[PDB]
Amino acid sequence: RPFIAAHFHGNTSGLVRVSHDAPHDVWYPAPWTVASPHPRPTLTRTGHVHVHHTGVYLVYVQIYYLDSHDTISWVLHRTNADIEGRETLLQCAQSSYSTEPIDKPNSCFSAAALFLKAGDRLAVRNTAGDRHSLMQPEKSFIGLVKLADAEDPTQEL
Amino acid sequence: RPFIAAHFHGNTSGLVRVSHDAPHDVWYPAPWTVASPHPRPTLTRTGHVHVHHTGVYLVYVQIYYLDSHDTISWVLHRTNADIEGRETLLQCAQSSYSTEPIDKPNSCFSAAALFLKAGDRLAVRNTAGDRHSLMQPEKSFIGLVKLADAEDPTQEL
Amino acid sequence: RPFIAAHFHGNTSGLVRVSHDAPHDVWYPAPWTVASPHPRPTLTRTGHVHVHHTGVYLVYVQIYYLDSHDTISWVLHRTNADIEGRETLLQCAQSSYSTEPIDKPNSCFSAAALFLKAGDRLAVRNTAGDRHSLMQPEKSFIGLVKLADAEDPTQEL
Numbered sequence: 001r002p003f004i005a006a007h008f009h010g011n012t013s014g015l016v017r018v019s020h021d022a023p024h025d026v027w028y029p030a031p032w033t034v035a036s037p038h039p040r041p042t043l044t045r046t047g048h049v050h051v052h053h054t055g056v057y058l059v060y061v062q063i064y065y066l067d068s069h070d071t072i073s074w075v076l077h078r079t080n081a082d083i084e085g086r087e088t089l090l091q092c093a094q095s096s097y098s099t100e101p102i103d104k105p106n107s108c109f110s111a112a113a114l115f116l117k118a119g120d121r122l123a124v125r126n127t128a129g130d131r132h133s134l135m136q137p138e139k140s141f142i143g144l145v146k147l148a149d150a151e152d153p154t155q156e157l
Numbered sequence: 158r159p160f161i162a163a164h165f166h167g168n169t170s171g172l173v174r175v176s177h178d179a180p181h182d183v184w185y186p187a188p189w190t191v192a193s194p195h196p197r198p199t200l201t202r203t204g205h206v207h208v209h210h211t212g213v214y215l216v217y218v219q220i221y222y223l224d225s226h227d228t229i230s231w232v233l234h235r236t237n238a239d240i241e242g243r244e245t246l247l248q249c250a251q252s253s254y255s256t257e258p259i260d261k262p263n264s265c266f267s268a269a270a271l272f273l274k275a276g277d278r279l280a281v282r283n284t285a286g287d288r289h290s291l292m293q294p295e296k297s298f299i300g301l302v303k304l305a306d307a308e309d310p311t312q313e314l
Numbered sequence: 315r316p317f318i319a320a321h322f323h324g325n326t327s328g329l330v331r332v333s334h335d336a337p338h339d340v341w342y343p344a345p346w347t348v349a350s351p352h353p354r355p356t357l358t359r360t361g362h363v364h365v366h367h368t369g370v371y372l373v374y375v376q377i378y379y380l381d382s383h384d385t386i387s388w389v390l391h392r393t394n395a396d397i398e399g400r401e402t403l404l405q406c407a408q409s410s411y412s413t414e415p416i417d418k419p420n421s422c423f424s425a426a427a428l429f430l431k432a433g434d435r436l437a438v439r440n441t442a443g444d445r446h447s448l449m450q451p452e453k454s455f456i457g458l459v460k461l462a463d464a465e466d467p468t469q470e471l
Contacts, residue, residue: 003370003462007427032370032429035467056160056189058215058302058372062424064407071262075295091295093221095261096253096410104409105385109424110219110266113164113300115189138389138405143427145372145461147302148160153192213317213346215372215459228419232452248452250378252418253410267376267423270321270457272346304459305317310349 004053004146006033006041010135015066020129023047023077024063027142041144048079048121049142054152057144060111061090061124064139066132068101073127074108080120089114091127103132107139115150161210161303163190163198167292172223177286180204180234181220184299198301205236205278206299211309214301217268218247218281221296223289225258230284231265237277246271248284260289264296272307318367318460320347320355324449329380334443337361337391338377341456355458362393362435363456368466371458374425375404375438378453380446382415387441388422394434403428405441417446421453429464 010016011028018024025047033040042050051057065072073093077086092108116122124142133140167173168185175181182204190197199207208214222229230250234243249265273279281299290297324330325342332338339361347354356364365371379386387407391400406422430436438456447454 005370005427005461009426030427030429031467032427032464035465038462056162060425062426064405073262088295091221091264092266093262093264094251094408095263097255097259097261098411102411104411105387105407106409107405107407107422107424108264109406110264111217111268111425112166112219112298113162113187113189113302115187138402141426145427147162148195150189151192153188213319230419245452248378248421249423250419250421251408252420254412254416254418265421267421268374268425269323269376269455270319270344270346270459272344304319305352307346308349310345 003038004040005144007143008043008049008141009137010140011137012135014134014136015132016135017130017132018126021125023123023125026135048123051116051120052118053146054118054150055146056113056148056150057116057146058111059114059144061142062107062109062140063124064107064134066103066105066134068103069131070097071095072106072108072131074124075127077123077125078120080117113147115153117152160195161197162301164300165200165206165298166294167297168294169292171291171293172289173292174287174289175283178282180280180282183292205280208273208277209275210303211275211307212303213270213305213307214273214303215268216271216301218299219264219266219297220281221264221291223260223262223291225260226288227254228252229263229265229288231281232284234280234282235277237274270304272310274309317352318354319458321457322357322363322455323451324454325451326449328448328450329446330449331444331446332440335439337437337439340449362437365430365434366432367460368432368464369460370427370462370464371430371460372425373428373458375456376421376423376454377438378421378448380417380419380448382417383445384411385409386420386422386445388438389441391437391439392434394431427461429467431466
């Protein structure tokens with residue numbers, strides 16, 4: 001049974017400013033992913049995760065913010081040659097009120113079983129412009145594990 | 158190998174007020190769950206997840222709050238014809254102090270490998286009365302994936 | 315197929331003060347883990363999870379803090395006879411500013427697909443001294459599920 005899976009983590013080879021509408025792109029495959037003998041999702045030079053096999057995947061994302069804004073939030077965007085624009089599959093948010101801009105650490109994690117198609121690209125974007133995150137391997141990452149085969153469950157109208 | 162798994166996400170077809178002790182009930186199966194050819198957990202009209210196969214499951218829950226209370230928290234309640242009342246399997250909490258009631262977004266995620274019996278019902282309740290959450294598919298959801306067969310690991314005394 | 319997996323949860327048989335640099339050690343296997351007929355990770359008397367089989371694991375941790383500090387954070391430490399000191403595999407953080415020390419609940423969850431070797435020990439430590447957490451089964455836990463075989467993906471230089 002092939003292990004169609006990959007883990008990519010932050011690697012600045014760690015504070016990174018992410019501009020409005022830019023995807024997080026300081027990802028790098030973990031060693032077990034680099035060494036994996038299995039067909040698997042891959043990482044593009046733009047920071048997108050490139051899915052090569054259709055199925056239901058467990059997808060998980062963590063962004064570790066070190067930021068002074070009251071609200072930090074990310075979205076997982078899915079693109080594909082067969083759809084116009086982006087689809088938002090997952091969202092995480094953390095928020096607290098402060099009167100002054102104090103930098104503070106907050107990791108925002110989410111995960112779900114998601115249907116993904118061969119040819120999909122996945123990117124993580126912040127929902128609002130200019131947030132700072134720590135791109136260190138234990139702090140920020142995106143990974144996915146194929147759980148089952150599946151036909152496309154949606155059709156056009 | 159059957160994929161005994163399901164994902165249900167928020168769908169108001171998105172802000173919902175959840176009354177004290179009421180379960181979150183604006184769930185709907187994701188398309189891959191609707192289309193799944195496999196035996197799987199199902200969703201009742203009360204919002205409970207109905208487990209049909211005994212085993213160890215990965216269970217995950219996210220509630221996306223948009224609320225002005227200082228503390229937001231949910232509990233995962235397990236019921237079954239063979240037990241009196243509810244069992245709390247999982248709990249999530251987020252809290253910060255503010256002097257005035259400012260609405261702010263906070264997603265509360267948790268997951269674990271849990272033993273579930275055929276006939277179990279699972280519901281998510283807030284721990285305190287009247288919190289508002291965003292019931293949109295990318296923001297709030299509950300899913301489970303059977304990982305292994307298992308006999309009942311507890312017995313009565 | 316063996317289910318090489320275990321779940322350990324907080325059990326004070328629930329507020330616990332964890333001293334600086336001490337590992338969380340009020341863990342206990344969940345009933346399905348106690349009853350599992352499979353080879354699996356085990357729990358040491360020091361609170362470390364003892365890995366017995368090399369592979370890629372889904373590892374997840376939740377610490378439920380009930381604490382008055384502005385920042386709460388934990389790290390997952392990996393040790394092994396073949397490495398000097400500790401490796402940090404995973405980190406979670408939550409932070410908000412308050413002018414006075416008000417106790418408040420915050421669960422800090424993270425998970426990832428991690429390469430683990432037979433003989434590894436895993437411990438959860440707080441990053442800063444003296445935080446209080448609730449060691450109740452639904453609130454705080456550490457679990458892992460082996461997903462695939464894997465050779466050691468790193469070599470010395």
